[PDB]
mmCIF file of C-alpha atoms in Angstrom:
data_model
loop_
_atom_site.group_PDB
_atom_site.id
_atom_site.type_symbol
_atom_site.label_atom_id
_atom_site.label_comp_id
_atom_site.label_asym_id
_atom_site.label_seq_id
_atom_site.Cartn_x
_atom_site.Cartn_y
_atom_site.Cartn_z
ATOM 1 C CA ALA A 1 -86.753 43.175 -120.963
ATOM 2 C CA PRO A 2 -84.966 39.832 -120.434
ATOM 3 C CA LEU A 3 -81.252 39.189 -120.844
ATOM 4 C CA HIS A 4 -80.828 36.570 -123.566
ATOM 5 C CA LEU A 5 -77.594 34.586 -123.256
ATOM 6 C CA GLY A 6 -77.260 33.087 -126.729
ATOM 7 C CA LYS A 7 -74.160 30.991 -126.080
ATOM 8 C CA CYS A 8 -73.841 30.376 -122.360
ATOM 9 C CA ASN A 9 -75.583 29.826 -119.043
ATOM 10 C CA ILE A 10 -75.198 32.049 -115.980
ATOM 11 C CA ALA A 11 -72.108 30.109 -114.833
ATOM 12 C CA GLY A 12 -70.195 30.634 -118.080
ATOM 13 C CA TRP A 13 -71.387 34.197 -118.503
ATOM 14 C CA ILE A 14 -70.530 35.283 -114.952
ATOM 15 C CA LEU A 15 -67.093 33.609 -114.928
ATOM 16 C CA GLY A 16 -66.301 34.684 -118.487
ATOM 17 C CA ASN A 17 -65.947 31.287 -120.168
ATOM 18 C CA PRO A 18 -64.005 32.070 -123.373
ATOM 19 C CA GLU A 19 -66.985 32.169 -125.785
ATOM 20 C CA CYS A 20 -69.345 34.103 -123.509
ATOM 21 C CA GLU A 21 -70.174 37.745 -124.184
ATOM 22 C CA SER A 22 -68.691 40.388 -121.897
ATOM 23 C CA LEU A 23 -72.131 41.949 -122.495
ATOM 24 C CA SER A 24 -71.037 45.528 -121.824
ATOM 25 C CA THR A 25 -74.389 46.710 -123.198
ATOM 26 C CA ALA A 26 -77.041 45.197 -120.922
ATOM 27 C CA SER A 27 -76.934 46.855 -117.502
ATOM 28 C CA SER A 28 -80.413 45.753 -116.418
ATOM 29 C CA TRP A 29 -82.905 42.946 -116.990
ATOM 30 C CA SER A 30 -86.134 41.440 -115.689
ATOM 31 C CA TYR A 31 -84.867 37.869 -116.064
ATOM 32 C CA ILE A 32 -82.157 35.766 -117.717
ATOM 33 C CA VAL A 33 -82.648 33.273 -120.542
ATOM 34 C CA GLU A 34 -79.833 30.710 -120.610
ATOM 35 C CA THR A 35 -78.226 28.528 -123.264
ATOM 36 C CA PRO A 36 -77.026 24.980 -122.427
ATOM 37 C CA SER A 37 -73.454 24.043 -123.375
ATOM 38 C CA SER A 38 -71.126 21.031 -123.223
ATOM 39 C CA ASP A 39 -68.900 22.425 -120.468
ATOM 40 C CA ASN A 40 -71.846 23.946 -118.589
ATOM 41 C CA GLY A 41 -70.045 27.280 -118.452
ATOM 42 C CA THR A 42 -67.024 25.929 -116.623
ATOM 43 C CA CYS A 43 -64.370 25.000 -119.183
ATOM 44 C CA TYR A 44 -62.129 23.889 -116.322
ATOM 45 C CA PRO A 45 -64.066 21.013 -114.714
ATOM 46 C CA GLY A 46 -65.257 21.515 -111.128
ATOM 47 C CA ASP A 47 -68.243 22.394 -108.944
ATOM 48 C CA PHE A 48 -69.918 25.811 -108.941
ATOM 49 C CA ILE A 49 -70.851 26.318 -105.285
ATOM 50 C CA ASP A 50 -74.081 28.004 -104.133
ATOM 51 C CA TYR A 51 -75.018 28.174 -107.806
ATOM 52 C CA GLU A 52 -78.816 28.186 -107.599
ATOM 53 C CA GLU A 53 -78.642 30.980 -105.037
ATOM 54 C CA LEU A 54 -76.494 32.971 -107.477
ATOM 55 C CA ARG A 55 -79.007 32.475 -110.296
ATOM 56 C CA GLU A 56 -81.646 33.958 -107.970
ATOM 57 C CA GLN A 57 -79.404 36.899 -106.997
ATOM 58 C CA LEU A 58 -78.806 37.725 -110.678
ATOM 59 C CA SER A 59 -82.410 37.169 -111.761
ATOM 60 C CA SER A 60 -83.717 40.742 -111.886
ATOM 61 C CA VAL A 61 -81.170 43.556 -111.766
ATOM 62 C CA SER A 62 -81.739 47.321 -112.068
ATOM 63 C CA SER A 63 -78.093 48.210 -112.608
ATOM 64 C CA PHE A 64 -75.124 45.967 -113.296
ATOM 65 C CA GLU A 65 -71.519 46.968 -113.816
ATOM 66 C CA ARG A 66 -68.309 44.978 -114.248
ATOM 67 C CA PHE A 67 -65.170 46.532 -112.737
ATOM 68 C CA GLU A 68 -61.569 45.406 -112.295
ATOM 69 C CA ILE A 69 -61.623 44.705 -108.556
ATOM 70 C CA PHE A 70 -57.974 43.641 -108.567
ATOM 71 C CA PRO A 71 -56.162 45.186 -111.548
ATOM 72 C CA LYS A 72 -54.216 42.478 -113.353
ATOM 73 C CA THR A 73 -51.088 44.543 -113.978
ATOM 74 C CA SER A 74 -50.570 45.852 -110.451
ATOM 75 C CA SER A 75 -52.226 43.508 -107.940
ATOM 76 C CA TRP A 76 -49.818 40.569 -107.956
ATOM 77 C CA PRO A 77 -46.187 41.734 -107.969
ATOM 78 C CA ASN A 78 -44.987 38.591 -106.146
ATOM 79 C CA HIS A 79 -46.818 35.977 -108.230
ATOM 80 C CA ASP A 80 -47.108 35.122 -111.924
ATOM 81 C CA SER A 81 -50.377 36.278 -113.484
ATOM 82 C CA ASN A 82 -49.401 35.531 -117.093
ATOM 83 C CA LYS A 83 -49.293 31.705 -117.262
ATOM 84 C CA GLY A 84 -52.815 30.747 -116.223
ATOM 85 C CA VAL A 85 -54.250 29.265 -119.405
ATOM 86 C CA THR A 86 -55.330 25.714 -120.112
ATOM 87 C CA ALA A 87 -56.210 23.282 -122.898
ATOM 88 C CA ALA A 88 -59.457 22.737 -120.989
ATOM 89 C CA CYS A 89 -60.417 26.255 -122.049
ATOM 90 C CA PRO A 90 -59.527 26.581 -125.744
ATOM 91 C CA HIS A 91 -60.478 29.591 -127.856
ATOM 92 C CA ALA A 92 -59.920 29.567 -131.618
ATOM 93 C CA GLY A 93 -56.831 27.352 -131.434
ATOM 94 C CA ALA A 94 -55.194 28.902 -128.366
ATOM 95 C CA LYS A 95 -55.164 27.868 -124.710
ATOM 96 C CA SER A 96 -57.247 30.309 -122.681
ATOM 97 C CA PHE A 97 -59.113 30.758 -119.387
ATOM 98 C CA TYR A 98 -61.956 32.639 -117.694
ATOM 99 C CA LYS A 99 -62.024 36.369 -118.414
ATOM 100 C CA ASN A 100 -63.014 37.332 -114.888
ATOM 101 C CA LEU A 101 -60.503 35.313 -112.841
ATOM 102 C CA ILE A 102 -56.728 34.925 -112.886
ATOM 103 C CA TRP A 103 -55.054 31.586 -112.305
ATOM 104 C CA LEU A 104 -52.008 32.756 -110.300
ATOM 105 C CA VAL A 105 -48.947 30.489 -110.172
ATOM 106 C CA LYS A 106 -45.470 30.651 -108.630
ATOM 107 C CA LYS A 107 -42.757 33.063 -109.720
ATOM 108 C CA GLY A 108 -39.463 31.214 -109.980
ATOM 109 C CA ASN A 109 -39.459 28.844 -107.011
ATOM 110 C CA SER A 110 -41.498 31.118 -104.759
ATOM 111 C CA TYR A 111 -45.154 31.554 -103.841
ATOM 112 C CA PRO A 112 -45.222 33.890 -100.821
ATOM 113 C CA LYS A 113 -48.397 34.291 -98.789
ATOM 114 C CA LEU A 114 -50.600 36.654 -100.736
ATOM 115 C CA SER A 115 -52.960 38.989 -98.931
ATOM 116 C CA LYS A 116 -55.242 41.335 -100.822
ATOM 117 C CA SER A 117 -58.315 43.237 -99.696
ATOM 118 C CA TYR A 118 -61.052 45.299 -101.307
ATOM 119 C CA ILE A 119 -63.353 47.785 -99.601
ATOM 120 C CA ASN A 120 -66.692 48.290 -101.308
ATOM 121 C CA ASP A 121 -66.734 51.993 -102.197
ATOM 122 C CA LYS A 122 -69.297 51.691 -104.996
ATOM 123 C CA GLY A 123 -72.358 52.512 -102.882
ATOM 124 C CA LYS A 124 -74.091 49.336 -104.036
ATOM 125 C CA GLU A 125 -73.703 45.587 -103.449
ATOM 126 C CA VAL A 126 -70.638 44.031 -105.062
ATOM 127 C CA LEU A 127 -70.556 40.446 -106.345
ATOM 128 C CA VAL A 128 -67.138 38.788 -106.104
ATOM 129 C CA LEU A 129 -66.267 35.386 -107.545
ATOM 130 C CA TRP A 130 -63.147 33.256 -107.159
ATOM 131 C CA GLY A 131 -61.885 29.732 -107.718
ATOM 132 C CA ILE A 132 -60.013 27.100 -105.745
ATOM 133 C CA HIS A 133 -57.770 24.798 -107.761
ATOM 134 C CA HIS A 134 -57.253 21.155 -106.781
ATOM 135 C CA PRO A 135 -54.273 19.577 -108.579
ATOM 136 C CA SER A 136 -54.258 15.919 -109.591
ATOM 137 C CA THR A 137 -50.798 15.074 -108.211
ATOM 138 C CA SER A 138 -48.321 16.352 -105.634
ATOM 139 C CA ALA A 139 -45.905 17.082 -108.507
ATOM 140 C CA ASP A 140 -48.432 19.411 -110.160
ATOM 141 C CA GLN A 141 -49.054 21.129 -106.815
ATOM 142 C CA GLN A 142 -45.319 21.828 -106.555
ATOM 143 C CA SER A 143 -44.970 22.873 -110.180
ATOM 144 C CA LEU A 144 -47.860 25.335 -109.906
ATOM 145 C CA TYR A 145 -47.571 26.671 -106.366
ATOM 146 C CA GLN A 146 -44.203 25.528 -104.973
ATOM 147 C CA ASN A 147 -45.710 24.822 -101.541
ATOM 148 C CA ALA A 148 -46.902 21.286 -100.785
ATOM 149 C CA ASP A 149 -49.297 22.193 -97.986
ATOM 150 C CA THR A 150 -51.384 25.274 -98.697
ATOM 151 C CA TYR A 151 -54.529 27.136 -97.707
ATOM 152 C CA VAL A 152 -56.821 29.854 -98.978
ATOM 153 C CA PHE A 153 -58.784 32.122 -96.679
ATOM 154 C CA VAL A 154 -61.592 34.465 -97.716
ATOM 155 C CA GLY A 155 -63.272 36.729 -95.196
ATOM 156 C CA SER A 156 -65.759 39.583 -95.054
ATOM 157 C CA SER A 157 -68.311 40.749 -92.477
ATOM 158 C CA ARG A 158 -70.801 38.137 -93.720
ATOM 159 C CA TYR A 159 -68.461 35.449 -95.042
ATOM 160 C CA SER A 160 -65.581 33.417 -93.666
ATOM 161 C CA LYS A 161 -64.063 30.247 -95.075
ATOM 162 C CA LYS A 162 -60.727 28.454 -95.078
ATOM 163 C CA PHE A 163 -60.102 26.163 -98.047
ATOM 164 C CA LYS A 164 -57.706 23.227 -98.235
ATOM 165 C CA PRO A 165 -56.891 21.828 -101.678
ATOM 166 C CA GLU A 166 -57.368 18.117 -102.155
ATOM 167 C CA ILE A 167 -54.732 16.678 -104.430
ATOM 168 C CA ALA A 168 -56.246 13.715 -106.275
ATOM 169 C CA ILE A 169 -56.676 12.178 -109.721
ATOM 170 C CA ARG A 170 -60.283 12.711 -110.789
ATOM 171 C CA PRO A 171 -61.628 11.273 -114.051
ATOM 172 C CA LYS A 172 -60.113 13.122 -117.018
ATOM 173 C CA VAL A 173 -62.486 15.796 -118.328
ATOM 174 C CA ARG A 174 -61.374 18.076 -121.156
ATOM 175 C CA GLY A 175 -57.847 16.836 -120.433
ATOM 176 C CA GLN A 176 -57.903 17.585 -116.708
ATOM 177 C CA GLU A 177 -57.642 15.175 -113.786
ATOM 178 C CA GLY A 178 -57.580 18.164 -111.443
ATOM 179 C CA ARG A 179 -60.643 20.212 -110.508
ATOM 180 C CA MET A 180 -61.540 23.841 -109.874
ATOM 181 C CA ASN A 181 -64.429 24.875 -107.625
ATOM 182 C CA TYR A 182 -66.101 28.273 -107.986
ATOM 183 C CA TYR A 183 -67.357 30.466 -105.165
ATOM 184 C CA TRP A 184 -68.990 33.846 -104.723
ATOM 185 C CA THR A 185 -70.172 36.267 -102.074
ATOM 186 C CA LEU A 186 -71.891 39.651 -101.889
ATOM 187 C CA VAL A 187 -69.985 42.478 -100.234
ATOM 188 C CA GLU A 188 -72.078 45.256 -98.687
ATOM 189 C CA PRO A 189 -71.267 48.934 -99.220
ATOM 190 C CA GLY A 190 -68.491 49.876 -96.797
ATOM 191 C CA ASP A 191 -67.463 46.302 -95.990
ATOM 192 C CA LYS A 192 -64.068 44.793 -96.736
ATOM 193 C CA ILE A 193 -63.287 41.408 -98.308
ATOM 194 C CA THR A 194 -59.860 39.855 -97.793
ATOM 195 C CA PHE A 195 -58.138 37.072 -99.718
ATOM 196 C CA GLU A 196 -55.184 35.208 -98.245
ATOM 197 C CA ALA A 197 -53.379 32.248 -99.821
ATOM 198 C CA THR A 198 -50.221 30.181 -100.008
ATOM 199 C CA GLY A 199 -51.403 28.545 -103.230
ATOM 200 C CA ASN A 200 -54.352 27.237 -105.254
ATOM 201 C CA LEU A 201 -56.290 30.504 -105.456
ATOM 202 C CA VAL A 202 -57.841 31.594 -108.727
ATOM 203 C CA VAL A 203 -58.099 35.281 -107.890
ATOM 204 C CA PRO A 204 -60.871 37.684 -108.851
ATOM 205 C CA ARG A 205 -59.973 40.051 -111.665
ATOM 206 C CA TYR A 206 -63.416 41.367 -112.550
ATOM 207 C CA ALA A 207 -66.272 41.708 -110.077
ATOM 208 C CA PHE A 208 -69.724 43.251 -110.414
ATOM 209 C CA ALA A 209 -71.579 46.081 -108.725
ATOM 210 C CA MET A 210 -75.352 45.803 -108.905
ATOM 211 C CA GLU A 211 -78.735 46.820 -107.570
ATOM 212 C CA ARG A 212 -81.734 44.496 -107.588
#
């Protein structure tokens, strides 16, 4: 039987756009039926990278399970994980954000280098998603992350990329002149994925274990 997304497309559903169902009932499907929406599943404007490939990966799944890859309460003792909401992502009158990612910002006037890894001990492929935030102005970069010149690195046995934020005023969309790009990779059983950043990283909170 198909998975019918009644409100969202795969982008919004997999990131956890505020209106999308956590769908903790459907653990398998033969295909996905998607619903178009104004923000295209990304309330914070930006580009979903390798998106068509992801739609194919999620097309027909035999088991599918969401798990808290990096527990919110314990993973980020040196950064602030409780301020990452935005008017771009409203929910019933309140500023909100994606369910499955955390927009980390500085704590006081500090954003130390974060380093966090996850070894896939689930015995099945794990899908991990994250975001890279690009502020509109150097002031916003400082206000959010303290550090003016930052990087994000993500590495596994099959993936390696270093990201540099571009600070620039894009056209205002849902109030935002900044942008957020979205990325994903599949981590094999036994492999380790590592995240390293001095700013601008929208960290995974929930990831997915699945079998095709």
